[PDB]
C-alpha cells in the first residue's frame, strides 16, 4: 500500500528477457564444442503463416484475441488508481486476463520454433511486447496487486491486421494493402503512445511519486491528436518530468515516422473513381451508344445537331463511353442534358463495359473519329477494332463509323457480320471531302 | 422546463427516416410478387435541372431560400438558452420558419420523383439534411418548444452554389467552376462544423447536462479557423466530452478532405 512494488512487475519483465536471451545463447555455445526438430520447425512455419486451415483458424484466432485484450485495458485504465491491492478470487478482469496470456504464451513458443534465427527472434518487437505483458500478469497472482505498468503494449497487436489479413487473401489490390498498413500504424501509435503518457503522468516522478497529474486515458488520447495536428491548445499538457521527456521523443520520432511515409501518402490518396455502374432504366424507350473521340467540342457539336428544334421530336437517349474522365467543362455539359445524356467510364474493347451500357439493346453504336490526328492510319485502325469488338458482342447491331481514309473501308467490308443492308454505314471523310 | 424533450425532436427526425425508407422498400417488394408515372418522372427531371424557365425560376428560388434559411439560424443561435418554451402565436421567427420548410418539403418530393433509384435517393446527404430540419419544425408546433437541435445542417445548402449556378450557365470556364466548388465546400464545412461544436458545448454531457460551456456561435466560428490553421491559441477550447470527441473526428476528417483537394489547389 504505502510502499509500491512497481519494480517487481517491471524487474520481472526483464528477467524473462536476459534469461531467455542467455539460455538460447548458451545452448548454441554448447553445441560449438559439444530428426523431428527439422520437421517440427517446418510445421511451425506453416502453422503461423495460415497456409492450412488448422493454421488459418489460428491466425484469425490471434486476430480476434488481439483486439479483445485491449478491451480489458480500457476498463482497467478507467480506474483512477494506477496501483491496486486485491486478491484474484474476487477480481473478474484478472481471471479473464489469465485466459488470454496463457494462449499468447504458447503462441509465442510456436513462433519461436518457426524462427530460423533464434537470437534475432528474441530481439523483435513482437517478442518484447509479450516480455512485458506475460510475466507481470503471472506476478500479479503472486504479488496480489494490480498495476497498469506497460499494459498499453497490447495495442501493438493491431499492426498485424495488414499482415494477418494478407494471409487470408482479403487484401488483393496494392492500394488496399498500403492503406491498411498506413491506417493500422497510425491507430496503434496513437493508442500506444497515449498509454505511455497516461502511465507517466498519473504515476509521477520516480522515488517520490508526489506530483501526480491525474489524467483520464481518453483525455490523453485527445491530448495526442491535438499534439499530432500541431494545434496545441494547452488546456491539457504534461507536467511531470518523465511525461515531458517522452513527449520530446514522441515529437522527434513522430515526424521521422511521418517523413518515411510522405512518398507513399502522396501517391495513394490522390485517386478517385467517379464514373461507373451499369445502365439501368425503364423499358419502352430507345437509346444509342457513342464512343471513339469524346472531347468537349466533339460532344457539344454532336448534341447541338442531334437535339435540334427542326428535327422530328423523338425520344432517343444518348450514352457516351470513354476511357478517360471528363474535365470540368464536359461534366457541366452533361448536367445541362441530364434527362437526355448520360456518361460512363470504360472502353469498347472490354466486353464487361459493353454489357454495362447495354449495347445489345441500343439502336446503333456511333464511333467518332479524331479528324485532327497526326497519323490517320493509326486512328483508322483503332476505330476499326472498335467495330470488331462491338460486332463480337452482338452480330445484330447498327454501327456508324467515321473513316479517315478510303482504302481502310475494305477492311470493314470484309467483316463477316458487317451488312450495309441492315443499317451499317461508313462515312469516309476523305471520300466525302474530295467528292 | 426542468425535463427536456430534446429526444422528441431528435427521435422524430429518424422516424421520418426509417419509415420513409421502409415504405419505398416495401412497395418495391409488393410489385415483386404482385402511363403518367413515366411522364411525371421525366417532367420532374427537367424541373429540378433548370432546363426550362418554369424550372429555371425554381432552382434559383431554392438558391435564394437556401441562404435565407441560414439567417434565421444566426438570430436563433444568438440566444444563450439552447432550449426554449414559447407558443407559436407570439414567436416571429417560428412563423417565418413554417413558410420555408413547407416549400422545401414539397421540393423534396419533386426531387424524389425525378430520382431513378428511390432507395439510393433516400440515402443521399441532401435527403438526410431535410430529414433533420423538416420534421422537428413541425414538432415544435406540437411540443410548443424551441430547440437548436441539428439546425446547422442548413449550411449544407451552400454547396449547391457551384451546381445550381452551373445550371444557369454563369460558370463557363473550368477555372471558375473549380474555385467555386472549393470555396463553397470550405465555407459550408466551416459553418456546419461550428454549429456542431456550438450545440455540443452548450448542451453538455448527456443525461446530466451539468457541465455546460456557454459559448457564442461566432466564438465557435473563430475557434475552428484557429483550429484549421493549426495555430491553437487555447483561449477557446472544447471542455465537454462530446465536444472533444467530435473535435477528434473533425481533425481526422478535415485533413482527409484537405488531402483530396491538394492536387487541385496546386494547379
Ligand atoms: C481511436 C480514437 C477515436 C476517437 C475516440 C474519441 C476521442 C476521445 C474523446 C475523449 C474526450 C475526453 O476528454 O473525455 C474524457 C473521458 O470521458 C469519456 O468517457 C470518453 C469516452 C468516449 C469513448 C468513445 C470512443 C470509444 C471507441 C473526460 O473524462 P472525465 O469525465 O473524467 O473529465 C474530467 C475533467 N475534470 C478533471 C476537469 C473533472
Ligand atoms: C521505431 C521506428 C522509428 C522510425 C523508423 C523509420 C520508419 O518510419 O518506419 C516506418 C514505420 O515505423 C513504425 O512502424 C513505428 C512503430 C512504433 C510503434 C510504437 C510507437 C509509440 C510511440 C513512440 C516504416 O515501416 P514499414 O511500413 O516499412 O513496415 C515496417 C514493418 N512494421 C510495420 C512491422 C514495423
Ligand atoms: C464566414 C466567416 C467570416 C468571418 C466572420 C467574422 C469571424 C467571427 C469573429 C467573432 C469573434 C467573437 O468571438 O465575437 C463573439 C460574437 O460577437 C459578435 O457579435 C460577432 C458578430 C460578427 C459578425 C460579422 C460577420 C457577419 C457575417 C463574442 O461574443 P460575446 O460578446 O458574447 O463575448 C463573450 C466573452 N465573454 C464570455 C468573456 C464575456
Ligand atoms: C464526407 C467526406 C469524407 C472525405 C471523402 C473524400 C473527400 O474529400 O471528398 C471531397 C469533398 O468531400 C466533402 O464534400 C465533405 C462534405 C462534408 C460536409 C459536412 C462536414 C462537417 C464537418 C465534418 C471531394 O468532393 P468533390 O469535389 O469530388 O465533389 C463531391 C460532391 N459533393 C461536393 C456534393 C460532395
Ligand atoms: C508534431 O508532432 C507530431 C507527432 C507525431 C505525428 C504523426 C503525424 N504527425 C505528427 C506530428 C503530423 C505531422 C506533421 C504536422 C508534419 O501529421 O498528423 C497526422 C495526423 C497527419 C499524422 C502523422 N503521422 C502520419 O501521417 C503517419 C501515417 C502512418 C502512421 N503515421 C504516423 O504515426 C504519424 O507519423 C504520426 O506519428
Ligand atoms: C488541423 O485540423 C484541420 C481541420 C480541417 C482543415 C481544413 C483545412 N485545414 C484543416 C486543418 C488545413 C490543413 C492543413 C494545415 C494541413 O488548412 O487550412 C485551410 C484553411 C487551408 C483549409 C483546409 N481545407 C481545405 O483546404 C479544403 C479546401 C476546400 C474545402 N477544404 C476544407 O474543408 C479543408 O479540408 C478544411 O477542412
Ligand atoms: C530496451 C528497450 C526495451 C527499453 C527498455 C527500458 C524500459 C522498458 C524500462 C527501463 C526503465 C523503465 C521505467 C522506470 C521507471 C518508471 C516510472 C514508473 O512510475 C512507471 C514505469 C517506468 C516509466 C518504467 C517504464 C519502463 C522503463 C522505461
Ligand atoms: C447515420 C447518420 C445520419 C448519423 C446518425 C446519428 C446522429 C444523427 C444522432 C445519433 C445520436 C444523436 C446525438 C445524441 C445526443 C446528443 C446530445 C444532445 O445534447 C445534443 C444532440 C446530440 C448530440 C445528438 C445529435 C444527433 C446524433 C449524433
Ligand atoms: K502548427
Ligand atoms: K500551434
Ligand atoms: K497554446
UniProtKB/Swiss-Prot annotation, chain B:
Tissue localization of expression? Expressed in muscle cells, neurons of the CNS and PNS, mushroom bodies, a limited number of cells in embryonic and larval midgut and in epithelial-derived tracheal cells. During pupariation and embryogenesis, it is expressed in muscles many hours prior to the appearance of functional channels.
Q: Which domain of life is it from?
A: Eukaryota
Q: Which residues lie on this side of the membrane: Extracellular?
A: 79-93, 140-143, 201-213, 237-245
Q: Which residues lie on this side of the membrane: Cytoplasmic?
A: 115-118, 165-179
PTM notes: Phosphorylated. Phosphorylation may be mediated by both PKA and SRC kinases, which activate the channel activity. Phosphorylation by PKA is however unclear. Indeed, although modulation of channel activity requires Pka-C1, it does not interact with the whole PKA holoenzyme.
Residues buried in the bilayer without crossing it run 214-236
Cell compartment(s), UniProt: Membrane
The membrane spanning regions, by residue number, are: 6-26, 57-78, 94-114, 119-139, 144-164, 180-200, 246-266
Family of this protein? Belongs to the potassium channel family. Calcium-activated (TC 1.A.1.3) subfamily. Slo sub-subfamily.
Q: Quote the protein name from its UniProt record.
A: Calcium-activated potassium channel slowpoke
Organism this protein belongs to: Drosophila melanogaster
Q: Which residues of the full protein are shown?
A: 44 to 337 of 1200
Amino acid at each position: 500500500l504505502k510502499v509500491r512494488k512497481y519494480w517487481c512487475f517491471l524487474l520481472s519483465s526483464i528477467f524473462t528477457f536476459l534469461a531467455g536471451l542467455l539460455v538460447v545463447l548458451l545452448w548454441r555455445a554448447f553445441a560449438f564444442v559439444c530428426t523431428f526438430m527439422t520437421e517440427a520447425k517446418d510445421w511451425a512455419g506453416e502453422l503461423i503463416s495460415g497456409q492450412t486451415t488448422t493454421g488459418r483458424i489460428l491466425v484469425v484466432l490471434v486476430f480476434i484475441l488481439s483486439i479483445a485484450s485491449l478491451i480489458i485495458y480500457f476498463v482497467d485504465a478507467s480506474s483512477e488508481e494506477v496501483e491496486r491491492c486485491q486478491k484474484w478470487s474476487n477480481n473478474i478482469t484478472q481471471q479473464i486476463d489469465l485466459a488470454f496470456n496463457i494462449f499468447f504464451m504458447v503462441y509465442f513458443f510456436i513462433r519461436f520454433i518457426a524462427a530460423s534465427d533464434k537470437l534475432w527472434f528474441m530481439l523483435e518487437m513482437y517478442s518484447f511486447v509479450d516480455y512485458f505483458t506475460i510475466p507481470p500478469s503471472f506476478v500479479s497472482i503472486y504479488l496480489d496487486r494490480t498495476w497498469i505498468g506497460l499494459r498499453f503494449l497490447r495495442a501493438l497487436r493491431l499492426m498485424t491486421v495488414p499482415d494477418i489479413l494478407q494471409y487470408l487473401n482479403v487484401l488483393k489490390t496494392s492500394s488496399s494493402i498500403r492503406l491498411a498498413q498506413l491506417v493500422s500504424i497510425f491507430i496503434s501509435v496513437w493508442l500506444t503512445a497515449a498509454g505511455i503518457i497516461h502511465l507517466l503522468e498519473n504515476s509521477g516522478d520516480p522515488l517520490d511519486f508526489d506530483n501526480a497529474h491525474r489524467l483520464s486515458y481518453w483525455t490523453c488520447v485527445y491530448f495526442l491528436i491535438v499534439t499530432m495536428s500541431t494545434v496545441g491548445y494547452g488546456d491539457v499538457y504534461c507536467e511531470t518530468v518523465l511525461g515531458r521527456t517522452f513527449l520530446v521523443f514522441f515529437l522527434l520520432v513522430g515526424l521521422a515516422i511521418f517523413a518515411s511515409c510522405i512518398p507513399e501518402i502522396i501517391d495513394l490518396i490522390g485517386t478517385r473513381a467517379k464514373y461507373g455502374g451499369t445502365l439501368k432504366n425503364e423499358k419502352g424507350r430507345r437509346h444509342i451508344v457513342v464512343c471513339g473521340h469524346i472531347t468537349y467540342e466533339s460532344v457539344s457539336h454532336f448534341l447541338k445537331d442531334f437535339l435540334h428544334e427542326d428535327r422530328e421530336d423523338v425520344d432517343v437517349e444518348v450514352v457516351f463511353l470513354h476511357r478517360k474522365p471528363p474535365d470540368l467543362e464536359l461534366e457541366g455539359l452533361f448536367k445541362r442534358h441530364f434527362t437526355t445524356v448520360e456518361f460512363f467510364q470504360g472502353t469498347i474493347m472490354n466486353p464487361i463495359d459493353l454489357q454495362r451500357v447495354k449495347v445489345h439493346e441500343a439502336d446503333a453504336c456511333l464511333v467518332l473519329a479524331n479528324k485532327y490526328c497526326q497519323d490517320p492510319d493509326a486512328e483508322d485502325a483503332a476505330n476499326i477494332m472498335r467495330v470488331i469488338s462491338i460486332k463480337n458482342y452482338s452480330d445484330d447491331i447498327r454501327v456508324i463509323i467515321q473513316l479517315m481514309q478510303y482504302h481502310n473501308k475494305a477492311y470493314l467490308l470484309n467483316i463477316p457480320s458487317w451488312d450495309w443492308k441492315q443499317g451499317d454505314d461508313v462515312i469516309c471523310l476523305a471520300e466525302l471531302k474530295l467528292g
